[PDB]
């Protein structure tokens, strides 16, 4: 996916390599990519 | 007003409401009905 992450969001990986997404406005984390709405 | 599907309201030890999202398995103080804490 070439799109940037939207404002407030950061991507990290779990130890076992799963992408997850951190929302620093709402203080949430999720496997849902904020660019796609899917995990 | 009802929360979105999969969401629940809980309360902290000091009685502050917060929102539990069982679809994504996360929590926030920001009410998803309004976008404010």
């Amino acid at each position: 996916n070439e799109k940037p992450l939207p404002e407030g969001w950061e991507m990290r990986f779990t130890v076992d390599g799963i992408p997850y997404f951190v929302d620093h406005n709402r203080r949430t984390t999720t496997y849902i990519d904020p660019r796609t709405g899917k995990s | 007003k009802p929360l979105p599907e999969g969401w629940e309201m809980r309360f902290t030890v000091d009685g502050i409401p917060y929102f539990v999202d069982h679809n994504r398995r996360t929590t926030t103080y920001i009410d998803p009905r309004t976008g404010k804490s």
Partner: peptide
């Protein structure tokens, strides 16, 4: 510190 509520893993 920001205000963040209890974590899902801790309360579920």
């Amino acid at each position: 510190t920001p205000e963040a509520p209890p974590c899902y893993m801790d309360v579920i």
